[PDB]
Amino acid sequence: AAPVLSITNASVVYPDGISTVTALDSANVEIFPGELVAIVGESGSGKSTLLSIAGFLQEPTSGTVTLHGAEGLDATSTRREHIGFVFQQPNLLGSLTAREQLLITDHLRGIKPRKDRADELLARVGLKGLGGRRVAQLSGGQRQRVNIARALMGNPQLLLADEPTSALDARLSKEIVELLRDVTKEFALATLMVTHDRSQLAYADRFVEMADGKAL
Amino acid sequence: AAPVLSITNASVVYPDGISTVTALDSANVEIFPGELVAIVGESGSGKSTLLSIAGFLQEPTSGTVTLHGAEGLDATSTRREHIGFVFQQPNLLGSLTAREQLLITDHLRGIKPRKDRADELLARVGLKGLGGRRVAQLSGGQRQRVNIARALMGNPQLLLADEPTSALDARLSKEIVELLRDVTKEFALATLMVTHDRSQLAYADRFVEMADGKAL
Amino acid sequence: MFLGIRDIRAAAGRFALIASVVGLITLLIVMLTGLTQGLGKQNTSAIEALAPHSVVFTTAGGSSPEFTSSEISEQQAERWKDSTPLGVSQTRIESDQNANTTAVMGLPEGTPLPDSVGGFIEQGALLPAELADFLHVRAGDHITLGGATVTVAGTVKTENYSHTPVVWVDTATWQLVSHTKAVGTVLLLNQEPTIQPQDNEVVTDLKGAFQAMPAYKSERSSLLSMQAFLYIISALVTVAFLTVWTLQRTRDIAVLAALGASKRYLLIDALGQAAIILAAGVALGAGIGALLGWLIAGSVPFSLGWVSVLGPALGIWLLGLIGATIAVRNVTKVDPQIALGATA
Amino acid sequence: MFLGIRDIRAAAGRFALIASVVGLITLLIVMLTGLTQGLGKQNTSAIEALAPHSVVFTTAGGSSPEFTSSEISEQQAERWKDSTPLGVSQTRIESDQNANTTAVMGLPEGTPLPDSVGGFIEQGALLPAELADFLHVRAGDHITLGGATVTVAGTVKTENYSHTPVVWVDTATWQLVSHTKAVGTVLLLNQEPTIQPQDNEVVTDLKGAFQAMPAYKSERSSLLSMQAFLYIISALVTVAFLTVWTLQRTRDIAVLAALGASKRYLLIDALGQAAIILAAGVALGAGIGALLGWLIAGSVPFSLGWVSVLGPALGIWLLGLIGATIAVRNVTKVDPQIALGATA
Numbered sequence A, B: 001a002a003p004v005l006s007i008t009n010a011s012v013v014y015p016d017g018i019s020t021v022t023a024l025d026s027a028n029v030e031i032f033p034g035e036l037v038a039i040v041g042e043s044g045s046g047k048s049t050l051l052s053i054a055g056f057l058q059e060p061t062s063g064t065v066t067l068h069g070a071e072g073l074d075a076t077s078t079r080r081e082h083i084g085f086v087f088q089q090p091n092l093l094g095s096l097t098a099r100e101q102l103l104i105t106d107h108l109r110g111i112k113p114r115k116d117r118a119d120e121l122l123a124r125v126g127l128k129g130l131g132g133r134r135v136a137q138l139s140g141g142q143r144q145r146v147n148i149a150r151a152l153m154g155n156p157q158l159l160l161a162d163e164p165t166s167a168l169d170a171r172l173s174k175e176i177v178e179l180l181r182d183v184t185k186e187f188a189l190a191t192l193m194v195t196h197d198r199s200q201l202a203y204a205d206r207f208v209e210m211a212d213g214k215a216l
Numbered sequence C, D: 001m002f003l004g005i006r007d008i009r010a011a012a013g014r015f016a017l018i019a020s021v022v023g024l025i026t027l028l029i030v031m032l033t034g035l036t037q038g039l040g041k042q043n044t045s046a047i048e049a050l051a052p053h054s055v056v057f058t059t060a061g062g063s064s065p066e067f068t069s070s071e072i073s074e075q076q077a078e079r080w081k082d083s084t085p086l087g088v089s090q091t092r093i094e095s096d097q098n099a100n101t102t103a104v105m106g107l108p109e110g111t112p113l114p115d116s117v118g119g120f121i122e123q124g125a126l127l128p129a130e131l132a133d134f135l136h137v138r139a140g141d142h143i144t145l146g147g148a149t150v151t152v153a154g155t156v157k158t159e160n161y162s163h164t165p166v167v168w169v170d171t172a173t174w175q176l177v178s179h180t181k182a183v184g185t186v187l188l189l190n191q192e193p194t195i196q197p198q199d200n201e202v203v204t205d206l207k208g209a210f211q212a213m214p215a216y217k218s219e220r221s222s223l224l225s226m227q228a229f230l231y232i233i234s235a236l237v238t239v240a241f242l243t244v245w246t247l248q249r250t251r252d253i254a255v256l257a258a259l260g261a262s263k264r265y266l267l268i269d270a271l272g273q274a275a276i277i278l279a280a281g282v283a284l285g286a287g288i289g290a291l292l293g294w295l296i297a298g299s300v301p302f303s304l305g306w307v308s309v310l311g312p313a314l315g316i317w318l319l320g321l322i323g324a325t326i327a328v329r330n331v332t333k334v335d336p337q338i339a340l341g342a343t344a
């Protein structure tokens, strides 16, 4: 079984006016279909940085990141066709409704938006009957979960979840990471899930812990 | 000992195009100096709504909210002079540095910004040597904690913290809610702290749990 | 343009406000353009009104024909058939109660005049009503026109030559008033010239005939100057404005980019949206122009055609699309991660 | 304005772009204004150039004095001491090679002319060089001027009356050319009038004397029209623009409001910021105007004073402050909780 994502020996360095900051340091990661690898670490250890190159949101200062079965494609088309993002904050488009937050992804992927899949994904994340809400009529955790629902609308093979339960009561957190695990296995996804709720490791195949930009 | 904040019998109802949503339902809350009352509940139960009227961010549809020793003042001057907000999301002003996020509050309160108090509050929240960072060079948890630090810059008597550890590893969460408790007691603050980390009740004098807009 | 179009319902006030500034600009253009096409006709409306296809002049030095220095001999008038001879002079007109200088055009008796002016060339002098008022004369009175006594045959409307209203008189009277044997100054050709000109003759299209008016040239400079700074400063101000507008979309665009939106996709969205708001604003500004303009032709000169309103409107709509393009290209140029640094 | 000012260092490109559009607007005004103050002098520059304080006219009907219908009898010329008599006529000028109509002004011999024109009234005729070229004549030649032969005493610069350059001739020659016993058309007073006028006389300030020129009035309409639509459409386009600009600050303003920022505070911040960007843009647009304008006076008429550049600039700066005020008042009007609904 070949890996879905190879982060081969990869680093991120930022200019600090004069000096530098090594956000991520020689990351080596390989994730195979059906795997859900939790990511853990103290605030500001490289967790989001690792997801951002894993997501082709930026090229790594060094090393390479390769999604397989998408070799021979540009970064953007890769994201569009093969990756799902649960952004660290909800990043909802402020003029759409809850339902539209998801449909717009069908749209930009070039297919007629499926009003009914949207409604179902909205229900799984615990938001049935809220698909008409404007962003400003949603709570923080409600938003997180539209954000989550949006990630699940496509047919990706890599799923990147950046602390997707941060705003959820324990009950719902369990449901979410349960859902993540399920669609990971049902669909043989490679899933990277950042979290601080170390309890949730229970649902993860393996896990990478991070300090000072490195894996341990 | 008289209460610092009386939320006497207070409600919030929002238009839902046609119908309504009763965000908060007949809330009764009274908080006395030196008290840290945790607030708990599932996602979308009224936790933020209760803080927003507690904060004079909106008038309640019904009932009254009265900060004592600030009777005979308008809403805005009340917030400016007597309340500290740790917003549910960081709400950092995007052209300021970490240090400036705090100094600007001295400024709008009309006093010469104290560059050194800022630096110290930044260190307590675990961000020493990061006071020059632009928002985009801070991590999610780093931002949360500038947000937190900013709340502590004034001389408030009511402190409203809306899930202030959502983005923090367990280690730092403990430190934060520890800090919250300390400055609450040191200064005889009334503190309302929304959280889902039920472990942290340990540091709270009492706590209100919420479902469907009501306290239980 | 899933997102682009719902931004508009989500915030119809914001977009009205932006269509205003685009419309207000189209207004300012459609207005000033026609106010300056106005001053321009203050030299040309009279020969315009006479609608000649070609107009044969006369120079001997092979030089640029000039209305001040050309004349048609009575025999010249036959080497061109299907031609009418027009006399153009500027002379003093004098009533008992006042005087002025004024343009005098001569046509052969009975020549029907432009409906812009109305009537027929009678014997004697046909005065703009505004000129008759000024002089305090009526049909039947006597005026001195170039020192000759002439009878006011009647009044007419006002077309213009070199900044004065034209007094219409018959060839013989124009000959008297201008002190010449010539039958006119130029010849008016309604069809096309089925003949060729001598070494000393020269046909001009009605566009060129303006070149022969001495006041036209020494002004055409000052009007094109306005017509130019107007379009320059304007197109720049538009391109700039649509850029700072579309730039308020960086965040939503950056989110869309991260999710995988292709740059074509995002360009289409941003253009399709601006298209709608621009189209509304030019349509609205070109409408209030025409109307508010047609409603002001007197007491103020204001010429305005259809390449003169639909002309700019298609120009702002085209330029506003560009300014949006500058903004989207700017966001989509960079790695989505950095753009989400704008997001806060 | 803690935040307002650091927004500027944080994003100096964005603010350049906004100062551009404000400057580009100040440009368009400073330009068109002086291009139209240009056409205006095409009737007035010559008597302007002669700088009279008061100018005594002559009517018998107690009516509005008119340059076409007034004349000063040789005895009238003594009931006003410290006065000079000016003759203003429009007549045909004719050389061997060409002809034209042109304004002829008469002053007594030896009268020093405006430095705008240069020289002294000699006997005979002083021709604008551009007119001499056109006619193909030099000092010493002969021209017909109003049917009288007159000698070109020399050439001079060009001031203007009713849309033509003025030919400067001595009183006797002007009397010959205009066919009159009168010594002039009006009297020029350099000090103030230490005497009163008869039933048929009337003094005007130099501002009023323009009212007596027939071409001035029938145009002053068309120029004020431009001067007006320019300032209207402009001030609206500015007020609108600064509003959509300051509106990009809603979020940061809403955060500040929630923390406790008073509406004065937020107004001060928003005004202080716009102040700086506006001031930069008008300064820059009024600079490139003057320069680019002074650099274009010929081949194009362009009059521009200091109430004509510092005049608009203070007007956009004032109006742009308003448009920012409209935006801040809009955000600070509402309960901070709702504004943070804009935040997303």
Ligand SMILES: Nc1ncnc2c1ncn2[C@@H]1O[C@H](COP(=O)(O)OP(=O)(O)OP(=O)(O)O)[C@@H](O)[C@H]1O
Pocket (backbone or CB within 6 Å): A014, A015, A016, A021, A022, A023, A041, A042, A043, A044, A045, A046, A047, A048, A049, A050, B136, B137, B138, B139, B140, B141, B142, B167
């Ligand atoms: N654009 C930047 N410029 C400079 N330094 C940066 C930049 N982005 C991040 N950093 C620093 O790089 C480190 C990695 O940040 P990152 O967000 O990846 O950590 P994290 O563990 O994912 O964050 P958290 O757990 O607190 O949400 C942090 O220490 C941060 O201060």
Ligand SMILES: Nc1ncnc2c1ncn2[C@@H]1O[C@H](COP(=O)(O)OP(=O)(O)OP(=O)(O)O)[C@@H](O)[C@H]1O
Pocket (backbone or CB within 6 Å): A136, A137, A138, A139, A140, A141, A142, A167, B014, B015, B016, B021, B022, B023, B041, B042, B043, B044, B045, B046, B047, B048, B049, B050
């Ligand atoms: N402006 C609004 N219009 C309509 N409904 C709203 C509006 N704001 C909130 N709601 C609804 O009101 C309820 C209260 O939201 P609130 O954010 O107070 O809950 P919360 O418990 O604080 O949120 P969470 O724990 O998920 O962050 C939610 O059920 C939400 O759907």
Ligand SMILES: [Mn+2]
Pocket (backbone or CB within 6 Å): A006, A008, A030
């Ligand atoms: Mn590999």
Ligand SMILES: [Mn+2]
Pocket (backbone or CB within 6 Å): A047, A048, A049, A088, B139, B140, B141
């Ligand atoms: Mn992070």
Ligand SMILES: [Mn+2]
Pocket (backbone or CB within 6 Å): A140, A141, A166, A167, A168, A169, B043, B163, B196
């Ligand atoms: Mn929550």
Ligand SMILES: [Mn+2]
Pocket (backbone or CB within 6 Å): A212
């Ligand atoms: Mn280090």
Ligand SMILES: [Mn+2]
Pocket (backbone or CB within 6 Å): B006, B008, B030
């Ligand atoms: Mn009470």
Ligand SMILES: [Mn+2]
Pocket (backbone or CB within 6 Å): A139, A140, A141, B047, B048, B049, B088
């Ligand atoms: Mn909440």
Ligand SMILES: [Mn+2]
Pocket (backbone or CB within 6 Å): A043, A163, A196, B140, B141, B166, B167, B168, B169
């Ligand atoms: Mn975190």
Ligand SMILES: [Mn+2]
Pocket (backbone or CB within 6 Å): B212
């Ligand atoms: Mn309910």
Ligand SMILES: [Mn+2]
Pocket (backbone or CB within 6 Å): C172
């Ligand atoms: Mn005859």
Ligand SMILES: [Mn+2]
Pocket (backbone or CB within 6 Å): D172
């Ligand atoms: Mn004499």
